[PDB]
Design an enzyme around this catalytic site. Structure first.
Site, short mmCIF file in Angstrom:
data_model
loop_
_atom_site.label_atom_id
_atom_site.label_comp_id
_atom_site.label_asym_id
_atom_site.label_seq_id
_atom_site.Cartn_x
_atom_site.Cartn_y
_atom_site.Cartn_z
N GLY A 169 3.68 5.32 12.50
CA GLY A 169 2.68 6.40 12.50
C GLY A 169 1.70 6.22 11.37
N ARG B 186 -4.42 10.78 8.75
CA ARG B 186 -5.04 11.30 7.51
C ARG B 186 -3.92 11.56 6.47
N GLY C 73 -1.37 9.87 5.75
CA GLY C 73 -0.76 8.63 5.26
C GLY C 73 -0.09 7.88 6.40
N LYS D 210 7.90 8.46 4.86
CA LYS D 210 6.52 8.95 4.91
C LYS D 210 5.88 8.65 3.56
CE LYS D 210 3.51 12.94 5.89
NZ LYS D 210 3.51 14.36 6.31
N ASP E 82 2.81 24.62 11.09
CA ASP E 82 2.12 23.53 11.83
C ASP E 82 3.00 23.06 12.99
OD1 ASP E 82 0.01 21.86 12.52
OD2 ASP E 82 0.60 20.34 11.03
#
Ligand SMILES: COc1cc(-c2cncc(-c3ccc(C4CCN(C)CC4)cc3)c2C)cc(OC)c1OC
Ligand SMILES: COc1cc(-c2cncc(-c3ccc(C4CCN(C)CC4)cc3)c2C)cc(OC)c1OC
Ligand SMILES: COc1cc(-c2cncc(-c3ccc(C4CCN(C)CC4)cc3)c2C)cc(OC)c1OC
Ligand SMILES: O=C(O)[C@H]1CCSC1
Ligand SMILES: O=C(O)[C@H]1CCSC1
Length: 285
Positions: A14, A17, A19, A34, A132
């Site tokens: 992945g 924006r 990272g 991540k 989110d």
């Protein structure tokens, strides 16, 4: 004693924006790493502060392993979690269709994770709102259940600052959200939950019929919709995702259409709670 901190980064799974996310290896074991952009450092701080406050452990919450800050010539920020090789629900729904049992297992597991976030346990844990929720922030496990990911915007009883526009509740778009009331943030999550339910239900086969994968509001807003684009649809025109006729021939999809309607009321206080959604889903089939 030796503290083994080496992680081998094996493949990028992945990029955005925010990272990058990498599949990595630590001591023979798959981990997800991540790596935060300078743009999104606040998400690393918020998730880290939350896990420093309460070590969440739940089958339907992405499993925390570590938060790392490393000094460079800049600062490198990593979040290390469990790795789910099947990827996000968004990814999974693109190719895969569902039967009744697999559809219900997915959405009840998401409801279970979300209720676990929302509930204050007085033993325990503070109440948490995600802020989110979307199909890219849900991972699929091999056992057919999902887990909720990305607490970089989470609030505890704001943040990096707004969620994904396509999934924003009407009160966020029209700026009437009562921002000092914690229950407001739960109700925003329930709205987004309803949209995820719709995305999954479309991929459940009934009577030889299925819908193609589409994101919520695919038919009324462009890609990367503006705040204004979303406000006009959700607030001014009060549009909601279409329920196909074919759902009304299937008892499961009929029950799921009613549930998603009860997540989409303009009045946030009318929406079902995550615990009530869980109970409703346990009585379906
Ligand atoms: C610092 O950094 C990282 C460390 C590790 C890691 C590697 N081996 C062992 C450990 C460990 C855990 C726990 C104890 C306990 C033992 C009992 N005692 C009473 C209290 C202390 C000791 C050691 C850790 C935490 C992994 C990391 O990545 C996965 C790290 O991040 C780069
Ligand atoms: C961060 O993550 C991982 C860490 C480890 C790991 C490595 N060394 C030691 C430990 C450990 C030992 C003992 C205690 C306790 C025991 C009871 N009392 C005395 C308090 C202290 C805590 C911790 C761990 C947990 C392994 C992992 O996987 C196998 C991890 O996952 C990637
Ligand atoms: C949402 O958020 C986070 C997610 C993860 C995470 C954990 N397991 C597996 C994944 C994954 C693996 C593989 C694919 C595939 C899909 C098919 N094709 C497109 C190539 C790639 C997608 C996804 C991810 C992305 C980790 C996180 O932090 C470490 C996240 O942030 C909190
Ligand atoms: O990046 C930010 O703005 C956060 C760092 C820690 S607290 C605020
Ligand atoms: O308190 C809760 O709702 C969590 C316990 C396990 S499942 C959800």
């Amino acid at each position: 004693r030796t503290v083994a901190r080496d992680i081998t980064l094996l493949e990028c799974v992945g990029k955005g924006r925010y990272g990058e996310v990498w599949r990595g290896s630590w001591q023979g074991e798959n981990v997800a790493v991540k790596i935060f952009s300078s743009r999104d450092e606040k998400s690393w701080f918020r998730e880290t502060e939350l896990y420093n406050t309460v070590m969440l452990r739940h089958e339907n919450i992405l499993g925390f392993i570590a938060s790392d800050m490393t000094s460079r010539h800049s600062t490198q920020l990593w979040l290390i979690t469990h790795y789910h090789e099947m990827g996000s629900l968004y990814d999974y729904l693109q190719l895969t269709t569902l039967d009744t049992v697999s559809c219900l297992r997915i959405v009840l597991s998401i409801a279970s994770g979300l209720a676990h976030l929302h509930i204050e346990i007085f033993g325990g844990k503070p109440a948490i709102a995600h802020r989110d929720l979307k199909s890219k922030n849900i991972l699929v496990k091999k056992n057919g259940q999902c887990c909720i990911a990305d607490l970089g915007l989470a609030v505890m009883h704001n943040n990096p600052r707004v969620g994904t526009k396509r999934y924003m509740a009407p009160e966020v778009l029209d700026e009437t959200i009562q921002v000092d009331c914690f229950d407001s943030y739960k109700r925003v999550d329930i709205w987004a939950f309803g949209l995820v339910l719709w995305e999954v239900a479309r991929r459940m086969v009934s009577n030889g019929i299925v819908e193609d994968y589409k994101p919520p509001f695919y038919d009324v807003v462009p890609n990367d919709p503006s705040f204004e684009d979303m406000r006009k649809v959700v607030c001014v025109d009060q549009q909601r995702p279409n329920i196909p006729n074919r759902w009304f021939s299937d008892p499961t999809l009929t029950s799921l259409a009613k549930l998603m309607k009860e997540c989409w009321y303009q009045n946030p206080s009318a929406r079902l709670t995550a615990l009530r959604i869980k109970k409703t889903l346990t009585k379906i089939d």
